[PDB]
Amino acid sequence: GAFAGRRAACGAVLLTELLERAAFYGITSNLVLFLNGAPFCWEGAQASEALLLFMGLTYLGSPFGGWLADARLGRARAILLSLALYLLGMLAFPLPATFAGLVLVGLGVATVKANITPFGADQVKDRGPEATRRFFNWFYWSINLGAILSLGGIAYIQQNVSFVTGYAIPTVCVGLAFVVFLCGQSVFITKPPDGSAFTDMFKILTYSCCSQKRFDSCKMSHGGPFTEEKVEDVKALVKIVPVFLALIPYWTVYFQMQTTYVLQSLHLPAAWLTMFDAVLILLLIPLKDKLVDPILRRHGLLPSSLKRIAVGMFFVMCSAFAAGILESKRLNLVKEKTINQTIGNVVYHAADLSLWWQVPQYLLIGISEIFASIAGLEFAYSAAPKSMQSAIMGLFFFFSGVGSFVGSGLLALVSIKAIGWMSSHTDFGNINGCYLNYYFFLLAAIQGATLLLFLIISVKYDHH
Template sequence: MVLLFHHTWLLTSSSLEMDETSMYLLLEKKGEDCVYTKDGSLDYHNNPANKLKTGRWKACIFIVATASLERLAYFGMSSNLLLYFKLELNQHSATASRNLSNWTGACYIAPLLGAFVADGYIGKFWTIACSSVLYAIGMTLLTASALAPRLFKTDVTEATDSQTVACFTALYLVAMASGGVKACISAYGADQFDDNDKAEKKLKSSFFNWYYQMMNIGSLIAHSLIVWVQDNVGWDWGFGIPTLAMVMGVVSFFSGTWFYRNHKPGGSPLTSLFQVVVASLRKKRINMQTDASLLYEIADANSSTTGSRQLNHTRNLSFFDKAAVETASDREKGSINPWRLCTVTQVEELKAVIRLLPIWFTGIIFSSVRGQVDNLFVLQGSFMDTQIDNSSFIIPPASLGTIGTLSVIFWVPVYDQIIVPLARKLTGHPNGLTQLQRMGIGHSILVFSMLAAGILEVIRLDFVERHNYYDIKPVPISIFWQVPQFFIVGCAEVFTLVGQMEFFYEQVPDSMRSFGSALRLTTIALGSYMSSLLVTIVTEVTTEDGGPGWIPDNLNYGKLQNFFWLLAVLSVLNLGIFVVVAKWHASKRSVEMIM
């Protein structure tokens, strides 16, 4: 399976490999001064990283294979987990749904802890290494809990307390471990490209595209093959195969150890941000310097925070500039108190994080709307004809979600190999589109997906009314009419979600890149909670008069199209907010970039 991912990656990125070979030849001609990275990255032996021997695609093959196998393991385990809770642990539907939601939320909140540990203390490599091993242990325990009833019980219809405890112990061990992997894996892959090398920085943008592509291949295998095994073979094999995939992911990650570029952690970057807040509040009454060159900064080009580059001063959020205004009392004891006087770079790092928050907020709304793919799209499909040409083969409504995954797999090479070169000619931007432009296009595309879903529901309900099929399930309209809305969602993901990955990596301080990835992931968790809240509110409001409401148990009596119209309007409003905050946003600029 590892070889499958490696070969797929090599085939899809062959043109990128050719670019890398050309750069190698160029480096050899330029001589030793250009052989080593300029971003402070180190090899496994803590020596300056050699561009000819470390990083780039040769390192990313192992990282992306690990990420793909982790996604296969995660979705192979989680996609059918609700059914496992109901059938094997004998939980009520509401209890099973609540337990699954709580666990999923934990999986997407845990990256904040993983990022804190990685950025502040042990670095991305050891965070991924330790977390992936713990991940594999947790999945092994989950498989053992599913296998145990077959080995030790004759009556497997009732779950024991020990089986339930073992299952949830394993699941929350996986949740904690996945936080370390999710927070670091994409950022660590991007670390393999030197920001101070224009050629490598250009390749980094392609990395995010192919990284997301390979993750979706892992997800596709999980949602098709693994789910089929769980339904038709058994849960021991259904969990055992994802566990094997995760073990292979661990092997893949360690196999690339000698090719990786690593950055030293610089202690808790959050401490530096709090210092700016405290120092600026202490000096809230002083007059601001009109000349930014008079603000305090260390002399060399490095930041006071290990692992960060020095940043140029920006004029917005100027209140925090007071933290860098030097007063007579700042050096009273001979040394500078960092809680009273901060560097311009520290101030700019805080500004960079604050400027991310409006963009982050729009990501929550995007995720809440996109979350209907796994919710109301599936519910809509369950009231449509799932048979193929009157045969006995039935398509599970949830399986149509693979169309969205296939859409992503289709759109990634189209974007990277066709759209980017064309956009580059039109805009002159090295990446074709800026990160914000790319995300904005994705926001607008998502609107059309909700419109397509709403139009289909209007057509379906019109058919129900004309033929009096209110109590008929499924309605004889093919589920394949849902393909366009799933396909459009996949396109929106390639623009917005991949753009988010690159944006949050680039715009956070250098020492907080794992935190940037974790912050992006929280939009998924919060978007899921917001989606559930929205459904609850709509249900309460539309059933106040005793009617069936928009989303009744029998959709033939409902008005699901109105909910899709609401989501479309919400997406348009979110797009408007995004455009405003994108215009306000000022990108982080390092001194090296200015020079």
């Protein structure tokens, strides 16, 4: 009965999210390749910088998207405006203009990502937190399904017809999402926030900050016009911030592992490797949702989101250790024979080893994801105040982007001449004379330290 009733609205929201994710992954799958192979052939550095700027704008727009959704507008209306801007920007690709289109697409996706999760989360808030947890599980499953569908269909229909349609496919998807969402609204009534006074909440926050400049906060605000709700929201946000601060290195390690696993698998369509992870997720989310959760319900072992994030961090560390061991074995084997292969239009030298040895580590990462990210989202919805859930989601996405940037900086920094772990990394391939195993071991050590710090912070937070 918990999932009955608004099932149609939940399915519509999941379909819209799937279409949005498919369009985004279609955009990001071969943007650099399309720009390089286009008649306006730029340099590799120029395309890389454009992609990095696009990703940074998408990461940065999420807090402002949540701010715009929370203030002077609703949630569904802000989603509609964001996806309209997304469609308008995406229409430019099949046709300075490129910069404007990238800006529009980035703003649209940043607002959509920041606003879709809180809306669907509050849509099922009628029942207990278990309904929200199941909704988040199916939300992540739909995201992965959309990723797989895009990364397959792009190549599936790219060969049949002209390549322009390859970029026209996401746009149509966006349009479809638009229509679906519109229809959903006609029967949504998913407890619309109707946020009008929430704008004042923002200025109240500033007033509280002024009260800081002019448990000190509680006693100071008791005398003034600072009714307990806003003070408790400020306290909750203050408690939340260190969690994200500790989670930033986790996102750094996550993105670095995502890049390095593909880079290593290249030496055993290039996007299919990434699909592997998603495929594993598509296999793991349902089974767990039907088996892992009930058993705890039988034993009363239901942990907090922080404990599940810690378990995910432990699985990440185990996967990093396994990847390091596999890289060491591959380096030991490769010092005797090499095999020349071609992927796309690039020649790579790979060791005489099967590709299935990547199955264990990937599997571990999958478990970590199904134990961590979703749980974090639940926390991102649970501890956040009811007034500014979208702002909290936007800040979380911004912190994830900052972690990704820190990971890229660390990857650049572990390539200095004094380090000596890699010298052919500047070249496209020939990672045979490199030391990626040491990089994996360093990532595992950093993950362990971050896990310990997060455990301490989680214990301190749960004590209060």
